[PDB]
Write a protein that binds this ligand. Structure first.
Ligand SMILES: Nc1ncnc2c1ncn2[C@@H]1O[C@H](COP(=O)(O)OP(=O)(O)OP(=O)(O)O)[C@@H](O)[C@H]1O
Ligand SMILES: Nc1ncnc2c1ncn2[C@@H]1O[C@H](COP(=O)(O)OP(=O)(O)OP(=O)(O)O)[C@@H](O)[C@H]1O
Ligand SMILES: [Mg+2]
Lengths: 390, 393, 146, 152, 51, 836
């Protein structure tokens, strides 16, 4: 056997093993043989063997998707274009009211007289619907420390104006609508963005700059245009471009053509942001390690109105970060976290989290279950000093 | 099988024992009652004939369409093969866990209502990147590292073996390990070993294999590579010869280097970005590391960084006896005489010496390999050094 | 501009450009539709498009001069409740090399700073702090200059 | 082949599926099976490296252009299944064909046969061979100088 | 029909109203690998490749 | 190599088997000290059985012999200890504990955690084996545990500390060294492990937790625990002990929520306000504050709930003709439910007589009582409004007014007894309908108060001549609900007497099922203490005997989760209508721990897949009970399946169940399902009635009301609420004739369990004070190192937020420090001194 992990190890192992056996036994005693035809658990062929399927197949006919192209005369008469089938001039069934149908919206029509019965949501590139956040992160504004003025500005530009419009509307200030976050790698940009996404109360979209380069000409611009149309359907949304330097490259066309399609997509984003077509309720963020490369047209107010500098944290912020990350630990009681803050010279958040984890490591390798000071000193050594030359 | 989570301390304890004993006892009551019912009545006939009703509802000429958007409410837009787009009703017997956009759905012929789904191929890229067992050898064939292998084991293997250790204290494992050192020193081999020894799906890629000749293909490749790694449970990725893709990132450059930088940004986001990386680890190798980008090898992206020195005096003996292991040698083999020289030999150099000696032994028909052959082979292999002798010294 | 290169793709844009050229002034003269355009770079547009028959009148837009800067600031700060002490001539003079789209930043950020400091009406210092915000300048850790 | 992810396909190109199946088959069987797979190429560098791994086709052999003896031997073998006259001196034909290649010596045979056919006979003659080799080598040098002019 | 003989990649004739496999039509193997065996490759030695 | 060197070093002493035995002193101390240093040394990586321990294995017998009986001064002690250390790998007898029992008493920390854990386990085993006769042998063990426990506390090992001090049953010692830094964890765990543990031990654990929560002056938590235990005297000690007035406010709110009362002496400071708070009198003011803040005042008529126009009007003309009486009764019910407690109503208040006259016969009864539902928790003006309908021509309208007074007074304890004052007249009256209205209202007007005057008024009626089985049953219900958990003898006596008074033919009437319910409803929570009654019911007819016994058994062990009772009921299932109450009980016993509830869901799925019709028509109600106001997807699916069912009884029960499970949730998925479901059974009168009722329940209040009996972290079990739920559910066991017949007023039995879902935060002075509160699901943080976050999926709202089931609210800012750590219901806040 082994050294002995815990007194109950064997007892829990036994209860798990017989749990597995009883689960297998019920599996055999209930059937549930995997079916290659995608068919539900027999206890879930429910309303399915009968009584809803047989009641849904009778009244619910098959409508066919069609894309309205024109709505001529006040009298209902609709030209729809069924995909790869035909193109017709049809009328409205009674269920839909005339106001519901507009030009350009997908509609459903029946298979006999092709009259309109239901609208439908527009078609969005599968690669442009996933950038919605769906499940929001849990990081919050207590997890970001040593950046207090920066977070204040970000919160006053992306967050406060949506929650309390009347403050700004009364005095008559249209709040800035863009932020450029720039600072050394690993200083707190993406984390503050995560926090903003968690706290905010409106649609959030994550776009990577490297996600807008495409093989076929004139696709990236379409992607940007669709993204902004989608974001404009919502009531209010935030878009957070990462590594925007990916496609905001400076314009240097000369001689043989080089990186020109990226330039067209960049111009399309520029025109979407601030341009003839009004930008509705949208707020934009960008993060870059290298803000200089961004072109003169993007970095201009009206598109990126604010510029927040993230600098390496000061000593107070250093200890604060140490303490935030050393929270869910099984750690000793008294650690002079000021000592640890001093002992690491200018170092970023990533340094500090690495310090915490390396201290946990040096605790484990010593077969200890509570982290002490010596663990943290060893951690700081192994992190700062040893990995200096990189 | 969709069992309850104990969510006691999760570490061996009395509460984990009582929440565990309770589920066991309920399963016991259920099993007893079920066995009683089965003895009292088979129900085989009743469970049957439900298949018959289902197959009655789904007519014989079932049609394979292609789902394209689920309205979230037991409805769908299913596209027939030609290209038409219908708006059908999802019935009650389709296992909805298997319904996602792009799935080959099985529709009714007259009514196209969704009545099933089908499996798909498993090789978008899974086959081409997964390496299976390493043909070279297991941890046995590697010697002299000891400390490095220990680091890797703790970084990538130990968090899979016994999560309790890390979990007990509230610290997550390191994120990624970058293997750096002089060429021919045991990086790729150690990755191969920790691959063939662990229990996850290990994927390997060459950096020059991410340099694509159509725009926006490198970023797609990296995005996919990190896309079929969460589909597959715990997973490991090893991007070898990364130097060819991650470089200092000098801005005064023209050509396809911009695409290189753009794929580097995609990777830099995948490793640590907006979303949570799930359960995956990232190993990397680079013979030349001083030239990587600070944001790629920064702490939260790659916590562990491993140096790989050359064999010094004795690891040379170990490697030599490892590669000479399978060959009949004459009883005059002065191996130390070959090792004692401080010729800065590398591991791959040792393999080259072994193979060349074996090959000339084959050339001369001789049933055994002689020391003179090994020394001649050593001279021949070292002959591939060159350079300007007085210069620089 | 068109050019002779072995790399494809740009040819398609050039070709739709030829079609636009022909639409402006070509066979079948069109005398009912007029065209506008805007560009930051005119040094890269094709001569056949700057030709004196398709795009006849070309108009230059200079980085605004002092009078223009005061005018722009005044136009944009019209709604905000500003005090009767702000000397827009001063604010024009301390705003060298400011493209017109920059008071928007200054005007608005002055309002924002007035909000931050819990104020009601703006004052010269509010606009000055706005300007220091818009320039976006960094320090070198020291101020050896005299 | 020449790579496993080349055009962004994701390993699903047919050119790449054939290579994958070839790799699987090569790794199927053992070294001790008396089944040696000889592979050839006119362009080594483009050739994929996934073939040249250990446990696969490593050993390579260079091939310089053939020398005089090699040229004569190759001509002899390729003309073997042709009607010839008597006193045919292929050594002389080679002497009149310096710095030629395999395809050149393959073309000279067909040309000479066709000229003999125009002569309305069943046999090729040494004079006919001389004229054919003159034409083939003249067109070869013409192609070489045309390539040079294109480079110019 | 016994399913054992319905191999993948085989032609079959399906009925009109309700497609029901009710024959197994022939297939063309078209051997493309059985046209190049040369046996001992006679008249091909080291001797006539002098050099 | 290194292997050779270490082996040679180990042999340097292994070869000298008697190195200490040799007379020379140079090998006495130094050799054994060096061995201790080498063995105690740690290694790298896992390295199971570190190199020293592995290497000393073969030198085991001689290792013992060198100890044997040598000099006792130091050599014997050290040798014994080192033997104990190497006594780990062999994994044989208790050599570790034997040798540490006789050896050097060196600090344990020098040995490490691993050995300390192993020695703790060995000590636990030895104490278990050791008979109490060897008291002297226990003093060394108790010394060892007294040393072990502090090492476990200082090394963040509290869960195992409680475990060990449990195995030896000494859980009262935790107090003497618990310290501040590590008390929250120990109380949390010690409670968490208190429902899953057998009976006699659970009380001791709870005593321990309460004692500690006192020791550190943490009072409201101690009150929580004391009520859990259901000891009223400890609740006195907790309440009175406190001197801080605001904390007493907070205890008052908690107590008032529980529906338990404590009668302060008149000398307590600010007595009037304590009593006012504990009366839930102000609850209407706060409810209306919340309703105004969320701007949800507007009354919703039933049509808005129906949204018929959305559904495809295939039969918009001459469609299915459904019963008008049933439709208008259902409309009255849904109007009462949707506007409940908000006071106003577009339908009735504007013109209520016309709506009441749209209904028919008994529909006038439930229709009128809908008005009392509407003004619930508004005693003051409730009587002012209901006065008109109290005096009417139709008897049904008058009894409706009565049941309405009963509802309005419900849950709120006024000192003026309007309910007892008014409902006194007719309780003995002739008209059985009038009596039924009076009694149901009065029982709903006090349930859980255990008022002796009410009891001595009501109790005779169950023995009256002019008491039909409906009247007898309603009376038994009223007593059970007014004597919940009171082990009150009078109610039990009269109930039993009436039960044994009736002939076999009478017992066959379904309204006799309402006597066993009263009996079992008197005794809630007291398992194993009913065996006398189980003997008292052994003299009933076989079918009714089984029914009464099973029912009281299940009503005894409510809120237990006793697996043995689960197994016994399951044995019963695998016959009459007994089995229906067995099925309900399977859920009643297991309405506690989540583990119980989910495993019971599985058992119910199996019971439906395979089962007999009597079983099948009770599974829906148990599924409803096990999740009330907790619309989990799986219950919804496995219920909607049986909604569209051929077996009509199953259909009614499932539709009522899916209406409940969503009670007061406003679920979009559920509302859509029920709209579709009305579409399906548009031609079925009974199913359509059940559908309309469910559409009301789902929109109970407007999402601001929840029946869930449990509260305060799903831990405190409410007795009035569970009483009402049992009353309503059991009726449905013959759903067809009672509910879909002449007895639908029982549906007001849910009023017992109606509470709000608010979180309205007050300052020390009882004024609103909005604070940003993170709202989201809960996380269990038992035995998790550090202080790991205790919410996931959180959204930051303002104070007056609605907490659906399982939603725990935290404070966004450290600005205010709350009093009670359960930020639920009403809470008080105070300023943090060190805010910055
Ligand atoms: N102020 C901080 N407080 C807490 N954690 C921090 C802080 N700054 C950085 N970190 C840690 O740094 C890790 C690195 O991610 P982060 O979002 O900070 O990177 P970044 O600054 O956006 O970097 P990049 O420039 O490479 O995009 C975060 O996971 C967080 O753990
Ligand atoms: N310590 C060692 N034990 C066993 N084999 C070794 C050792 N060091 C080097 N080798 C040999 O080195 C050969 C080269 O493969 P390896 O994976 O070590 O390369 P690498 O160090 O990753 O090279 P590169 O820096 O070019 O990526 C392996 O086949 C192995 O035979
Ligand atoms: Mg290497």
């Amino acid at each position: 056997k082994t050294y002995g992990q815990s007194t109950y190890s064997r007892q829990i192992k036994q209860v798990e093993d017989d749990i597995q056996q009883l689960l297998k036994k019920i599996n055999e005693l209930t059937g549930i043989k995997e079916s290659d035809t995608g068919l539900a658990p027999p206890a879930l062929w429910d309303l399915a063997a009968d009584k809803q399927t047989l009641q849904s197949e009778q009244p619910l006919q098959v409508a066919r998707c069609t894309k309205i192209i024109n709505a001529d005369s006040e009298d209902p008469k609709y030209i729809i274009n069924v995909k790869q089938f035909a193109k017709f001039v049809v009328d409205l069934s009674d269920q839909v009211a005339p106001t519901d149908i507009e030009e350009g919206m997908r509609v459903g029509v029946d298979r006999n007289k092709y009259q309109i019965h239901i609208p439908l949501p527009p078609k969005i590139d599968p690669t442009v619907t996933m950038m919605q956040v769906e499940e929001k992160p849990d990081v919050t504004y207590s997890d970001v420390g040593g950046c207090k003025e920066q977070i204040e500005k970000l919160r006053e530009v992306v967050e406060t104006p949506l929650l309390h419009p009347e403050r700004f509307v009364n005095l008559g200030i249209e709040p800035p609508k863009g932020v450029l976050l720039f600072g050394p790698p690993g200083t707190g940009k993406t984390l503050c963005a995560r926090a903003v996404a968690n706290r905010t109360d409106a649609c959030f979209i994550r776009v990577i700059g490297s996600e807008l380069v495409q093989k076929y000409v004139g696709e990236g611009a379409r992607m940007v245009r669709e993204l902004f149309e989608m974001a404009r359907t919502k009531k209010a949304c935030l878009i957070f471009f990462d590594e925007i330097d990916a496609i905001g490259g400076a314009r240097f066309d000369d001689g043989a053509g080089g990186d020109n399609e990226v330039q067209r997509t960049m111009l399309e984003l520029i025109n979407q942001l601030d341009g003839f077509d009004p930008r509705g309720n949208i707020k934009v963020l960008m993060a870059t390690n290298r803000p200089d490369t961004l072109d003169p047209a993007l970095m201009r107010p009206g598109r990126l109105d604010r510029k927040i500098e993230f600098s390496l944290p000061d000593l107070e912020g250093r200890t604060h970060i140490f303490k935030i990350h050393a929270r869910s630990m099984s750690v000793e009681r008294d650690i002079r976290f000021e000592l640890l803050a001093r002992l690491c010279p200018n170092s970023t958040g990533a340094e500090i989290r690495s310090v915490c984890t390396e201290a946990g490591m040096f605790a484990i390798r010593a077969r200890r279950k509570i982290a002490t000071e010596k663990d943290f000193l060893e951690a700081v050594n192994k992190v700062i000093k040893s990995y200096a030359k990189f | 099988a969709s069992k309850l989570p104990l969510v006691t301390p999760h570490t061996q304890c009395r509460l984990k024992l009582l929440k565990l004993e309770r589920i066991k006892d309920y399963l016991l009551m259920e099993e007893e009652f079920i066995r009683n019912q089965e003895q009292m009545k088979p129900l085989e006939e009743k469970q049957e004939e439900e298949r018959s009703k289902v197959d009655d509802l789904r007519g014989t000429p079932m049609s394979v369409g292609t789902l394209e958007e689920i309205i979230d409410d037991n409805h769908a837009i299913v596209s027939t093969s030609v290209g038409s787009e219908h708006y059908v009703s999802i019935l009650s017997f389709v296992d909805k866990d298997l319904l996602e956009p792009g799935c080959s759905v099985l529709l009714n012929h007259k009514v196209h209502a969704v009545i099933g789904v089908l499996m798909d191929d498993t090789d978008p890229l899974v086959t081409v990147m997964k390496v299976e067992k390493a043909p070279q050898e297991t941890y046995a064939d590697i010697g002299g590292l000891d400390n490095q292998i220990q680091e890797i084991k703790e970084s990538v293997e130990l968090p899979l073996t016994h999560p309790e250790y890390y979990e007990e204290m509230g610290i997550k494992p390191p994120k990624g390990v970058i293997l750096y050192g002089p060429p021919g020193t045991g990086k790729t081999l150690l990755a191969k070993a920790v691959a063939n020894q662990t229990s996850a799906t290990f994927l390997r890629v060459v950096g020059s294999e991410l340099i694509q000749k159509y725009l926006g293909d490198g970023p797609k490749l990296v995005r996919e590579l990190f896309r079929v790694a969460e589909e597959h449970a715990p997973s490991i990725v090893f991007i070898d010869e990364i130097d060819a893709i991650g470089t200092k990132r000098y801005d005064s450059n023209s050509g396809g280097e911009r695409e290189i930088q753009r794929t580097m940004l995609e990777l830099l986001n995948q490793l640590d970005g907006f979303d949570s990386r799930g359960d995956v680890k990232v190993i990397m190798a680079t013979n030349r590391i001083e030239t990587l980008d600070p944001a790629l090898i920064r702490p939260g992206r790659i916590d562990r960084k491993i140096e790989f020195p050359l064999p010094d005096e004795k690891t040379k003996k170990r490697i030599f006896q490892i590669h000479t292991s399978r060959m009949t040698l004459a009883d005059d083999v002065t191996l130390d005489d070959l090792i004692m020289a401080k010729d800065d030999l590398s591991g791959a150099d040792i393999k080259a010496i072994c193979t060349e000696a074996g090959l000339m032994a084959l050339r001369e028909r001789r049933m055994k390999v002689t020391n003179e052959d090994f020394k001649k082979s050593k001279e021949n292999v070292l002959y591939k050094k060159q350079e300007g002798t007085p210069e620089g010294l | 501009k068109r050019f002779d290169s072995e790399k494809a793709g740009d040819r398609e844009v050039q070709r739709t450009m030829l079609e636009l050229l022909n639409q402006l002034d070509g066979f079948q003269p069109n005398t009912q539709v007029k065209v506008i355009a805007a560009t930051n770079r005119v040094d890269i547009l094709d001569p056949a498009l700057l030709r004196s028959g398709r795009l006849d009148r070309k108009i230059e837009f200079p980085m605004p001069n002092e009078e223009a800067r005061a005018r722009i600031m005044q136009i944009h700060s019209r709604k905000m409740n500003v005090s009767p002490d702000v000397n827009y001539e001063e604010l024009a003079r301390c705003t060298d090399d400011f493209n017109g789209a920059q008071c928007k930043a200054v005007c608005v950020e002055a309002g924002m700073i007035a909000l931050r400091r819990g104020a009601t009406e703006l004052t010269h210092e509010d606009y000055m702090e706005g300007i220091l915000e818009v320039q976006a300048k960094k320090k070198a850790n020291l101020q050896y200059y005299a | 082949g020449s790579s496993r992810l080349e055009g962004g396909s994701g390993g699903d190109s047919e050119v790449q599926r054939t290579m994958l199946e070839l790799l699987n088959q090569l790794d199927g069987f053992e070294a001790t099976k008396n089944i040696k797979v000889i592979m050839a190429t006119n362009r080594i560098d483009i050739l994929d490296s996934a073939l040249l791994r250990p446990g696969r086709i490593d050993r390579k052999i260079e091939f310089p252009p053939p020398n005089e003896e090699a040229r004569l031997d190759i001509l002899k073998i390729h003309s073997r299944k042709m009607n010839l006259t008597r006193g045919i001196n292929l050594r002389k034909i080679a002497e009149l064909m310096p710095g030629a290649s395999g395809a050149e010596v393959k073309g000279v045979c067909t040309e000479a046969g066709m000229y003999a056919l125009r002569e309305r006979r069943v046999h090729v003659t040494q004079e006919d061979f001389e004229m054919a080799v003159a034409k083939v080598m003249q067109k070869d040098s013409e192609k070489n100088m045309s390539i040079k002019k294109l480079w110019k | 029909i016994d399913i054992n003989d319905v191999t993948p990649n085989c032609r079959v004739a399906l009925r009109n109203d309700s497609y029901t496999l009710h024959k197994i039509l022939p297939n063309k193997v078209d051997p493309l690998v059985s046209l190049m065996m040369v046996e001992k490759v006679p008249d091909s030695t080291y001797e006539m490749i002098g050099g | 190599e290194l292997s050779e060197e270490d082996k040679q070093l180990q042999d340097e002493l292994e070869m000298l088997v008697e190195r200490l035995g040799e007379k020379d002193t140079s090998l006495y101390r130094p050799a054994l000290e060096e061995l201790r240093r080498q063995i105690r040394s740690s290694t790298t990586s896992m390295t199971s059985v570190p190199k020293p321990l592995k290497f000393l294995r073969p030198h085991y017998g001689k290792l013992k012999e060198i100890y044997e009986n040598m000099a006792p001064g130091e050599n014997k002690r050290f040798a014994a200890d080192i033997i104990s250390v190497l006594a780990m790998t062999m994994s044989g007898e208790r050599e570790c504990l034997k040798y540490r029992l006789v050896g050097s008493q060196e600090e344990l920390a020098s040995w490490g955690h691993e050995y300390v854990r192993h020695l703790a386990g060995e000590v636990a085993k030895e104490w278990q084996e050791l008979d109490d006769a060897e008291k002297v042998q226990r003093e060394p063990l108790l010394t060892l545990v007294k040393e072990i426990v502090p090492y476990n506390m200082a090394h963040n090992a509290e869960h195992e500390a409680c475990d060990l001090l449990m195995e030896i049953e000494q859980v009262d010692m935790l107090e003497k060294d618990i310290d501040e830094n590590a008390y929250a964890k120990v109380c949390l765990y010690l409670t968490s492990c208190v429902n899953y543990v057998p009976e006699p031990e659970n009380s001791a654990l709870l005593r321990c937790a309460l004692g500690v929560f006192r020791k550190f002056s943490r009072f409201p938590e101690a009150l929580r625990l004391a009520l859990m235990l259901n000891d009223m005297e400890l609740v006195e000690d907790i309440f009175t002990s406190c001197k801080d007035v605001v904390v007493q406010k907070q205890m008052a709110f908690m107590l008032g929520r529980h529906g338990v009362f404590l009668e302060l002496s008149e000398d307590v400071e600010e007595y009037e306000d304590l009593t006012e708070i504990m009366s839930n009198v102000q609850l209407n003011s706060n409810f209306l504050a919340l309703a105004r803040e969320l701007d949800i005042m507007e009354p919703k008529v039933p049509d808005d709930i129906y949204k018929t126009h959305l559904e495809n009007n295939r039969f918009g003309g001459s469609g299915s003709q459904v019963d008008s009486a049933r439709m208008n009764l259902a409309s009255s019910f849904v109007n009462g439910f949707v506007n409940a407690a908000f006071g106003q109503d577009k339908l009735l208040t504007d013109d209520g007589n016309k709506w009441l006259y749209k209904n028919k016969d008994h529909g006038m009864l439930s229709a009128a009582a809908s008005l009392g539902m509407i003004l619930l928790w508004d005693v003051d003006g409730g009587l002012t409004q209901i006065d008109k309908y109290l005096y009417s021509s139709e008897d049904y309208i008058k009894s409706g007014a009565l049941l309405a007074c009963g509802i309005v007074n419900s849950g709120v304890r006024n000192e003026c007894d309007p309910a007892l004052a008014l409902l006194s007249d007719y309780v003995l009256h002739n008209s059985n309908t009038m009596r039924l209205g009076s009694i149901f209202g009065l029982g709903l007007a006090y349930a859980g108060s255990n008022r002796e005057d009410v009891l001595t008024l009501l109790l005779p009626v169950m023995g009256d001549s002019k008491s039909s089985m409906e009247v007898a049953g309603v009376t038994a219900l009223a007593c059970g609900m007014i004597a919940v958990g009171s082990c009150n003898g009078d109610v039990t006596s009269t109930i039993l007497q009436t039960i044994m008074e009736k002939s076999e033919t009478e017992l066959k009437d379904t309204y006799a099922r309402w006597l066993p319910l009263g009996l079992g409803l008197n005794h809630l929570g007291k398992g194993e203490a009913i065996e006398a009654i189980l003997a008292a019911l052994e003299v009933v007819s076989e079918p009714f005997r089984s029914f009464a016994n099973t029912l009281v058994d299940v009503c005894a062990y409510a809120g237990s989760g006793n697996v043995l009772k689960v197994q016994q009921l399951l044995h019963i299932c695998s016959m009459g209508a007994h089995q229906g109450v067995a099925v309900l009980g399977i859920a009643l016993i297991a309405m506690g721990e989540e583990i119980g509830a989910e495993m019971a869901l599985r058992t119910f799925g199996h019971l439906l897949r395979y089962g007999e019709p009597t079983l099948r028509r009770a599974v829906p109600l148990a599924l409803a009970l096990i999740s009330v106001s907790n619309p989990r997807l799986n219950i919804l699916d496995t219920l909607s399946k049986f909604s569209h069912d051929a077996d009509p009884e199953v259909s009614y029960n499932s539709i009522f169940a899916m209406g409940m499970v969503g009670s007061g949730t406003n679920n979009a998925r559920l509302a859509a399902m029920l709209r579709q479901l009305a579409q399906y059974h548009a031609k079925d009168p009974n199913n359509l009635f059940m559908v309309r009722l469910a559409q009301g329940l789902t929109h109970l209040g407007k999402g601001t009301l929840t029946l869930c009996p449990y509260h305060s972290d799903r831990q405190l079990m409410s007795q009035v609420a569970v009483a009402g739920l049992l009353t309503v559910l059991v009726s449905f066991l013959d759903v067809r004739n009672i509910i879909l017949g002449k007895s639908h007023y029982v549906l007001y039995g849910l009023v017992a369990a109606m509470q709000p879902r608010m979180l309205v935060t007050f300052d020390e002075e009882l004024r609103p004070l909005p604070v940003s509160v993170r709202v989201g699901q809960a996380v269990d943080v038992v035995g998790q190192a550090g202080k790991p976050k205790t919410i996931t999926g959180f959204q930051t709202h303002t104070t007056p937020v609605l907490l659906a089931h399982g939603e725990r609210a935290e404070l966004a800012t450290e600005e205010f420090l709350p009093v009670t750590p359960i930020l639920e219901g009403f809470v008080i806040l105070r300023k943090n001194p060190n805010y910055d």
